[PDB]
Write a protein that binds this ligand. Structure first.
Ligand code: A1H6D
Length: 321
């Protein structure tokens, strides 16, 4: 069957931690009282959560309350544990409290308040660097986000702040573990997910990040538009080319679902110049394209790490200032 894989970095960080750190099923959640919060207004609905601005009436602080839709208790424990483990890290959303409604018994996460919110080449580089700080941090702490995408990035330009949010899909990396491929939004799914390669790692997040970068510098949202998980990889293959795809499939001895043999065909690797146009050219640089090229690889092992990405020339100006 498939050839195994291990993270190039942060491989064993969880093995070296106490079990309690990663064994979130055993975490006991103490719920506070929702009636210490009064909801003010709805901020937006998500797949498994609806978010409100609220007030803590004990001390009149503005906070954000994320009411969880029905999801298995294991997954609520997982998100809480991850948020607690990451709390205080660079650009990580800060979990303030965990509450349950006294009637409905529906659980809610309470966060620190941030505003949600014409982008300059510099701005994109800056905010991408800020995302990379959060990803390097969470990866270094043994956690994959698994859902990096614009909806999960809060940006307050006034204060030039960035928070990575919605850790509901995040999971701990353990070398050798086979994960669920049925995660992430379609447009941001890595090739590993699409070919059903389960022994994936932090590198998934780097693909998703590359997808984001492509969408912004090229003004094409989504960049890889798909009509079905199958067609999603077809769209990727039409850009990255089929030679490298089949090389990856061979290397890991991956078996490609029937619904893929007569749909991928044969495609050249397309040069990034083909996406550049007069109304995005101000966002596109040799540096940007070199960086993007080094994120968007089929082979998860060959993608830049977060820390490597931060050292790329695209970010030299940001690092300076
Ligand atoms: O409504 S909400 O549920 N979510 C909405 C957030 C929308 C963020 N997307 C905008 C965005 C961010 C970054 C980029 C970017 C920048 C530079 C380079 C590349 C991409 C762009 Cl172009 C766009 C929510 C709201 C408030 C607090 C919450 C607190 N906790 C949970 C949810 C929360």
């Amino acid at each position: 069957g498939p050839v195994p894989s291990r993270a190039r970095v942060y491989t064993d960080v969880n093995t070296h931690r106490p079990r309690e750190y990663w064994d979130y099923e055993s975490h006991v959640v103490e719920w506070g009282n929702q009636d210490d919060y009064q909801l003010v207004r709805k901020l937006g609905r998500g797949k498994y959560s609806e978010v409100f601005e609220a007030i803590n009436i004990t001390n009149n602080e503005k906070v954000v309350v994320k009411i969880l839709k029905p999801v298995k208790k294991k997954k609520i424990k997982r998100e809480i544990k991850i948020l607690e483990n990451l709390r205080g890290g660079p650009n990580i959303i800060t979990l303030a409290d965990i509450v349950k409604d006294p009637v409905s018994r529906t659980p809610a996460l309470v966060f620190e308040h941030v505003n949600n919110t014409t982008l300059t080449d510099y701005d994109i580089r800056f905010y991408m660097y800020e995302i990379l700080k959060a990803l390097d941090y969470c990866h270094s702490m043994g956690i994959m986000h698994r859902d990096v995408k614009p909806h999960n990035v809060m940006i307050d330009h006034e204060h030039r702040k960035l928070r990575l949010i919605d850790w509901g899909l995040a999971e701990f990396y353990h070398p050798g573990q086979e994960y669920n491929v049925r995660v992430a939004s379609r447009y941001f799914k890595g090739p590993e997910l699409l070919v059903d390669y389960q022994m994936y790692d932090y590198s998934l997040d780097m693909w998703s990040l590359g997808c984001m970068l492509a969408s912004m510098i090229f003004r094409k949202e989504p960049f890889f538009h798909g009509h079905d998980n199958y067609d999603q990889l077809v769209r990727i293959a039409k850009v990255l080319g089929t030679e490298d795809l089949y090389d990856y499939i061979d290397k890991y001895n991956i078996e490609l679902d029937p619904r893929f043999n007569d749909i991928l065909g044969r495609h050249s690797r397309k040069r990034w110049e083909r996406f550049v146009h007069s109304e995005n050219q101000h966002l596109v640089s040799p540096e940007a394209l070199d960086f993007l090229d080094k994120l968007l690889r089929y082979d998860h092992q060959s993608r830049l790490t977060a820390r490597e990405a931060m050292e790329h020339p695209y970010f030299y100006t940001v690092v300076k200032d």
